[PDB]
Structures are given as structure tokens and as C-alpha cells.
């Protein structure tokens, strides 16, 4: 890949289902001048998944309060991102996001950062912390089995800032 | 760069570590097929954040035990310099004595075969990499040089591997 600590992220282009339910063609660079944390998972419709990124949507606020932006991201087409949305929560389905989730289907994205499985065409679980002069400042890649944590990346995030300023 | 990758063997190496008894042994990673492993490079010697993080993980060794894993820290810096930060106690700046090995990577190799080696100031990354007991690499972290890491987000991380290991 091409995520490299101390250099720019790679920029991205894509479509994603945005928080009102309305797709987007959004990029990195429209997230200038606000940190963003960018993170991939593999595949809707799944079981680890769904409480990552429940959990980065539901607390939102917290990164929005450190002026931060999270994006979600997998290769999966954003009609099915979409359809996992519309599911009710009840039967499995992800509910109302405060979060962009952003499709890869070219699988260029997840080369670009570095974290496509490649014997498998879906992504491992790469998150990235982005400053907001689009440096990128953190690179963590888990393996398809295990989950991320809202807390221990708020707690990157606000350290990030507080040792910019220092 | 670097041949570190998910879900294949972790770059084998073979460096001089001062270990917990305070001598000098070469040690390979191989040594630890059959445990897992928590393999974490520090930028150099005698900083200010580093002995913070090295501290925590020695302090903390037992909780990996308990876990069956091994936790080995490294940089650039010579086996002396390590051996010399350790023979400083802590109340004056030092680490004081550790219950982990630290590895000395003087000729950069293993810090650029994890992809952590910062260009130009001959220094790595805050990198730190989870290996299986069947030495093949689960977890990859990398942070930029301000901002330390966390023993219980590690341990959290090792447990939850060894969790669905068992699936």
C-alpha cells in the first residue's frame, strides 16, 4: 500500500450511504482541516462488524466534539451498505447511522491503504487516524476475527491533538 | 515497505536482547513458536515517553503469562544502551529492572522488515505486532512517534485473538 506514517493519506473517491440514508460521492480531502478516522471492515451483513460500527455511530458525538470525522468503509456495494441500514436492529440490521459508510467494489481503496486480504478480495480491519492536514498519524490493521475499540481510538485521537499542540 | 503481513508467518529474527536477568542473549523469535507473542519497537534509548511504555509492559508481564504470551520490546540502539537504561533505576530516570527481554536492532534490518523504520532519523515508529502461537502475525499498530500505546487495549487484543482461536 501506500499509507505511510508522516505522509499524506492516500485520497480516495467513492460512493458511500450517507447518515440520511442518500448516497454520496465523497472524498478524504472533502474532510480537510478536521481529523478523520477511517476505518474498514469486510463485508455487510456480518457478526463482528455490526458492533464496531454501531459503536463508532452511536457515539458519534464524542468524536464530534473533538472535531473529528469517522468514515466507515468495505467492498461491499453501497446498495447493500444501504440494505444492512434499512434492516431493523431487531433481526440483525445496523439501524439509522451518524456515520458515512463508504463502498469499495474496485477494491482500489483497501490496496491503497494497505489492508486488502488478497486470497480473498475483502478487506482486513484497518483503521487510520488522519490529522487535519490529511497527514496520517496511526495505522491499525486487526485480522478478520477481532474487533476495534471506540475507546482506545478516542484515546489516540485526543492524544494526536494534544501533542500537536505541544 | 516491510514483509510484515496478516495471517502469514511474522519476519523472524535473531538479535542480541538484554534479558529480564539483565545479561546479554541472542535470541530469535522462533524461540516463542507455541506462545503468542507481543513484539513492540520503541524509537531509541534514554527518551521521555518510551520508558513510560516499557515500564507499563514490564510491570504488567505477569497478565501476559497468564495468557501464555511473551512480550519482547526493541529499537535501533545498541545492547550496551539498553543494558545501560536499565542498570539506571527508576527514581532517577531509568528503567529499573525488567521482567521482559529488549532487543537490539543496531542494523535497522528488523525494524524495516516490520515496515516500522522511519527514513532518514535511523529511528522506528511506535510499532507493535501481535504473533500467534503458530507464528504467524494477527495484529499490526503503528503509532507516530508522540503518542504511546496501551497495555490494556494489548491485552485486550491478545485475549480476544486467543478467544476466537478457539473457533
Redesign the interface.
Known amino acids: 500500500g501506500n499509507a505511510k ?2 505522509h499524506p493519506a492516500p485520497n480516495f473517491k467513492a460512493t458511500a450511504v450517507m447518515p440520511d440514508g442518500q448516497f454520496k460521492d465523497i472524498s478524504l480531502s472533502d474532510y480537510k482541516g478536521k481529523y478523520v478516522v477511517f476505518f474498514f471492515y469486510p463485508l455487510d451483513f456480518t457478526f463482528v462488524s455490526p458492533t464496531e460500527i454501531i459503536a463508532f455511530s452511536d457515539r458519534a458525538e464524542e468524536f464530534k466534539k473533538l472535531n473529528c470525522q469517522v468514515i466507515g468503509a468495505s467492498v461491499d456495494s453501497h446498495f447493500s451498505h444501504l440494505a444492512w441500514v434499512n434492516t431493523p436492529k431487531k433481526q440483525g440490521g445496523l439501524g439509522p447511522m451518524n456515520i458515512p459508510l463508504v463502498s469499495d467494489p474496485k477494491r482500489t481503496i483497501a490496496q491503497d491503504y494497505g489492508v486488502l ?1 488478497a486470497d480473498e478480495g475483502i478487506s ?1 480491519r484497518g483503521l487510520f487516524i488522519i490529522d487535519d492536514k490529511g497527514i496520517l ?7 478478520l ?3 476495534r ?1 471506540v475507546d ?1 481510538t478516542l ?2 485521537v485526543q ?2 491533538q494534544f ?1 500537536d499542540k ?1
Open positions: 506514517i508522516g486480504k482486513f498519524r496511526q495505522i491499525t490493521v486487526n485480522d476475527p477481532v474487533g475499540s482506545e484515546r489516540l492524544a494526536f501533542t505541544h
